[PDB]
A paper describes a structure:
Ras proteins act as key regulators of many cellular processes by switching between inactive GDP-bound and active GTP-bound states, the latter specifically activating several downstream signalling pathways. Mutations within Ras proteins represent major drivers in human cancer. In this study, we report the structure-based design, synthesis, as well as biochemical and cellular evaluation of nucleotide-based covalent inhibitors for KRasG13C, an important oncogenic mutant of Ras that has not been successfully addressed in the past. Mass spectrometry experiments and kinetic studies reveal promising molecular properties of these covalent inhibitors, and X-ray crystallographic analysis has yielded the first reported crystal structures of KRasG13C covalently locked with these GDP analogues.
Interestingly, only the 3’-isomer of the nucleotide analogues was observed in the structures, consistent with results of the MS experiments comparing the efficiency of labelling of the dGTP derivative and the mixed isomers of the GTP derivative and showing a faster reaction for dGTP. Both structures showed that the nucleotides are bound within the active site in a manner that is comparable to non-covalently bound GDP in other structures of Ras, with similar reversible interactions between the protein and the nucleotide and the additional well-resolved covalent link to Cys13. However, both structures lacked the Mg2+ ions in the active site despite a Mg2+ concentration of 2 mM in the Ras solution. In both crystal structures, the eda and bda linker are remote from the Mg2+ binding site and do not directly interfere with Mg2+ binding, suggesting that Mg2+ can generally bind. The eda linker led to the most efficient covalent protein modification. This tendency is presumably because of a favourable orientation of the reactive warhead and/or a reduced flexibility. Using dGTP analogues, the rate of covalent protein modification was further increased in the case of the eda derivative, indicating that the linker in the 3’-position of the ribose is superior to the 2’-position with respect to targeting KRasG13C. Whereas SOS efficiently catalysed nucleotide exchange on KRasWT, KRasG13C and as a control on KRasG13C:acetyledaGDP, it was unable to do so with the covalently locked G13C-edaGDP mutant, showing that the protein is indeed locked in the inactive state. Interestingly, in these experiments we also observed a drastically increased intrinsic nucleotide exchange rate for KRasG13C compared to KRasWT in the absence of SOS (blue area), an effect that probably contributes to the increased signalling and oncogenic effect of this mutant, and also this effect is abrogated in the case of covalently locked KRasG13C-edaGDP. In contrast, covalently locked KRasG13C-edaGDP was neither in the presence of GppNHp nor of additional SOS able to bind to the RafRBD.
Numbering used by the authors: 0 to 169
The structure:
Amino acid sequence: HMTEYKLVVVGAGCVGKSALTIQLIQNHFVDEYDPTIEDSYRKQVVIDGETSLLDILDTAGQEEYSAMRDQYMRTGEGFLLVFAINNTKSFEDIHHYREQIKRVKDSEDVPMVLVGNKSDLPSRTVDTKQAQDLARSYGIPFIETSAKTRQGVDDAFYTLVREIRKHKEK
Ligand SMILES: *CCC(=O)NCCNC(=O)O[C@H]1[C@@H](O)[C@H](n2cnc3c(=O)[nH]c(N)nc32)O[C@@H]1COP(=O)(O)OP(=O)(O)O
């Protein structure tokens, strides 16, 4: 009567992986480094009537190559690929994170969602159509988020859960 989902958040430094996680789990945000990430790893929530235990693994603080990152990529059932819409380099890095996950899984069909975070900020440098084209080429959804206003936060994590369900049922 509960179903666990193991969700992994990946992306360049400072894109908001940890803020997205804390907003989902604690309904909390601060515009600074948030030490409550240490306390923010499981949320129990009902999604489409299913009582779901969302275990969120946040790669913040890991080196770009580490044994713990590999453990996260091996255990994760779905991945959020996060970039920030005001940081072009973080968008350019998405290719690397996608390839790294695929190479661990030996699969071309891993549940993922592309997330463009910090959508509350003006002066974006990554346009939406760029991200839509990239997500289309990967076969995965794109969702714009803000960990500050909570724009898109439930949409991003719940969409990833629904992609996992589709994957499990064929
Ligand atoms: C990261 C460098 C930096 O910003 N340094 C200044 C101190 N402030 C922060 O670190 O702020 C963090 C978040 O509050 C902020 N953030 C995250 N998501 C945001 C959003 O949707 N809208 C706005 N306005 N700010 C947002 O970004 C900083 C980094 O977030 P993080 O969550 O700690 O980043 P990673 O885990 O991805 O490293």
